[PDB]
Amino acid sequence: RNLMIVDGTNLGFRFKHNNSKKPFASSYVSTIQSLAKSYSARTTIVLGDKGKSVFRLEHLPEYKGNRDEKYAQRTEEEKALDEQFFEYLKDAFELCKTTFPTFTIRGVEADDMAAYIVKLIGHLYDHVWLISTKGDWDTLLTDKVSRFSFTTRREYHLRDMYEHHNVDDVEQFISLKAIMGDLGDNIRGVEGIGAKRGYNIIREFGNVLDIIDQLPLPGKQKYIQNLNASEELLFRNLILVDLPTYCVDAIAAVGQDVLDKFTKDILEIAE
Ligand SMILES: [Cl-]
Ligand SMILES: [Cl-]
Ligand SMILES: [Cl-]
Ligand SMILES: [Mg+2]
């Protein structure tokens, strides 16, 4: 009765250390099978990353530049080990494809594919279970869309949004992420705004688009002065973090034909 969407590269890292040394294709597929039973998945779709986010790099050339730097500073042995891991992950994906619908699209993040699948076919299922450790995927939560993380073991539901993310709803989460950015993705945020302040700002003035319309905001605090100077950053960050709004555009960035093919494939699966 449910749809299960697997963040497949993310799952591969589950046992990254182990998965770099010995082949894991059979274990990988049996994990997905176990998850599908646990979550009563009538349909299971596995996603992988391939290349870099063309859409996000066009908006922010420095996007995930910290991650690129780390890869570039690997020792030759670290790199070989990673190359081994990715060869094993490729084998895992190939085996996976024999059993489950499995997609990679060069230049498109798994995030965008997942968001688009939920939009396109989520209505056909009782519940949608997202298998990912990425907090960014909680921009997709609803009354009928939840996430499971293998690292934390938590099942993430919309009703628990404040516990998880210091906001009450997805619109707020998206706006807060835009305001705060993310060090890990090399996305700058507005100086002096923590989760508390940001939530309070959103509850006062509205979402980031509403905030932008009201600049300059009243208030003497330095973090308000910082916000008032940040129209460009806020608008760009919203594009970078608002998965539901931009997921179609992010797929279309690599070719309308590629988006059309993906749409066709997903609708076939859901029939
Ligand atoms: Cl590599
Ligand atoms: Cl700032
Ligand atoms: Cl704060
Ligand atoms: Mg991110």
UniProtKB/Swiss-Prot annotation:
InterPro entries cross-referenced by the UniProt entry: 5-3_exonucl_a-hlix_arch_N, 5-3_exonuclease, 5-3_exonuclease_C_sf, DNA_polI_H3TH, FEN, FEN_D15-like, HhH2, PIN-like_dom_sf
Catalytic reaction(s) noted: Exonucleolytic cleavage in the 5'- to 3'-direction to yield nucleoside 5'-phosphates
Residue sites binding DNA per the record: 64
Result of altering residue 136 to K: Complete loss of enzymatic activity
Cross-referenced SUPFAM superfamilies: 5' to 3' exonuclease, C-terminal subdomain, PIN domain-like
Cofactor note: Binds divalent metal cations, probably Mg(2+). In vitro low metal concentrations selectively stimulate the endonuclease reaction. Endonuclease activity is suggested to require only the first cation, whereas exonuclease activity is suggested to require binding of both. High pH favors the exonuclease activity whereas low pH favors the endonuclease activity. Metal ions enhance substrate binding.
pH sensitivity of activity: Optimum pH is 9.3 for the exonuclease activity, 5.5 for endonuclease activity. High pH favors the exonuclease activity whereas low pH favors the endonuclease activity.
Residues that bind Mg(2+) 1: 111
KW Nuclease (keyword) present: yes
Effect of residue 222 to A: 10 fold increase in the dissociation constant for pseudo-Y binding. 10 fold increase in the dissociation constant for 5'overhangs binding
Ranges where the 5'-3' exonuclease domain occurs: 171-244
Residues binding Mg(2+) 3, per UniProt: 136, 182
HAMAP family: FEN_T5
Region feature (DNA-binding): 169-205
Cofactor(s) this protein cannot do without: Mg(2+); K(+)
Induction (record text): Expressed in the early phase of the viral replicative cycle.
Effect of residue 96 to S: Complete loss of inhibition by PHMB
This protein's domain notes: Three alpha-helices form a helical arch which forms a hole in the protein and through which the 5' flap of the scissile ssDNA is threaded.
UniProtKB keywords: DNA replication, DNA-binding, Early protein, Endonuclease, Exonuclease, Hydrolase, Magnesium, Metal-binding, Nuclease, Potassium, Viral DNA replication
Organism lineage: Viruses, Duplodnaviria, Heunggongvirae, Uroviricota, Caudoviricetes
Protein name: Flap endonuclease
Record entry for activity regulation: Inhibited by p-hydroxymercuribenzoate (PHMB).
